[PDB]
Amino acid sequence: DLNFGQVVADVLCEFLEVAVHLILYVREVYPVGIFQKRKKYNVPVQMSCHPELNQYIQDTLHCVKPLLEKNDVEKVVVVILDKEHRPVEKFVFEITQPPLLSISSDSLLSHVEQLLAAFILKISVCDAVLDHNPPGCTFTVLVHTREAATRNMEKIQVIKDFPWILADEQDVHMHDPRLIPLKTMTSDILKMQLYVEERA
Amino acid sequence: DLNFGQVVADVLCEFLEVAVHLILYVREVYPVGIFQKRKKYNVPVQMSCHPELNQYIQDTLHCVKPLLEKNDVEKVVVVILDKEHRPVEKFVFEITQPPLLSISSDSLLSHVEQLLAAFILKISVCDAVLDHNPPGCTFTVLVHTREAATRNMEKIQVIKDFPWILADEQDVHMHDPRLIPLKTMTSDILKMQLYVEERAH
Amino acid sequence: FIPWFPYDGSKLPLRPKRSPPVISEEAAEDVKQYLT
Amino acid sequence: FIPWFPYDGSKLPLRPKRSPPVISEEAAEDVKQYLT
16 A cells, blocks of 8 residues: 655645745745755755745745656746746756655655655755846746646645646746756655756 | 744644654554655654645644634644544643744744654653553544634635544543543743643542 | 533534545554655 | 656646746845744
8 A cells, every 4th residue: 555646746845845945945936044054865955934935935845746646747847937927946846756666665755765865965056056136036836747737737736726827938938048957866655856957 | 924834833733743644653653664764853763655645734733824823723633543543542642832922042943843842852752641442443633623623624724635524522532541641841932831631540 | 621612412513524544453554664 | 867757838837827926035135034
């Protein structure tokens, strides 16, 4: 028994929430002052203490959770938008969940969190390999589904008063971006790779 | 400028989630094997690793959060039930939120989290003061609102496919219970007290 | 000791319609062995 | 380096309809003062 789809959805959702907070801190999408240092996967991280920001991120990922359970997510993207609401930088989390079959009883949840820790560490240092963002940026989150992203509209709208829409091309497309790899992992339960798309 | 109604709702919801896990652990509602010892508020806690249990508890408290931010909650109650779904034991968290005035200091926050830590610490050892009756095998959570519960239905139903209902007398009422106080805190942004209702002798 | 909100049967509370899961000693064995 | 899922304009992604909150200089200072 045991619902590993739900186990992966859980682990992934917790990691993505921490990684979204860290991206906002490390790229200065919001002032350093709203963040508090915490530890996740035994890595020093930074979480926002602003209540409305925290609820927005929570709501966003709670909506993604049932899609990750079903493995209907190809990519989760944190898009950083400039003051004209155009994408200047994208943190792309590409995801695949292998058929869960040869499960390994040697502390699986402990092993996956060590794998995820390496992603947090890479985000923590990525300011040194990226150009600084211009002032006045905001962010959004994009969810790329494996099926047509209109079958999944009923399934993603999990949270009262938190509707989703189809993204517009201008919210997504960066022309000829520079790709900066950050980290790749593989495990019995999940494979992931993280890279940044930057303006060329 | 800042939603301190939202801050207290957030802190309370996060605390109540940890307390629910710990109550299930200490009162042996589920096998001890599902629990992992972690740390919250700088003190030890026991958190379930069972995914569906975790989701039930998280969804339950996420629905309570908008009622907390509106100061609409009088009690959150963990009801432990036997195989016939009769209440065995109720952990009653009584809550009041005073008007959020004189809100300053670098200290009003971690003072609250250390006050909440006192509740976790006491639950951890509450087997010492509670009766040693046979444990239950399931539970529910009750939300007692200041206004009529039937008109908090739209508001509490935050999560698709996680509906709420008005409780049945049967699942809530204990006759002449023994009341065992566990902890009480007062603060400028939150007062709370926790006691347990045991079956009568 | 005095509770602030003694039980009042005329103001019944809300609770979730769903139930928490049934967890066997064998599902609990797998949780411990697999999910720490 | 090669991405697993290159950008494909034929399948647009989903995004939340509401934007995240705008936090002013002023609001950030209060968060720093009281909440951290």
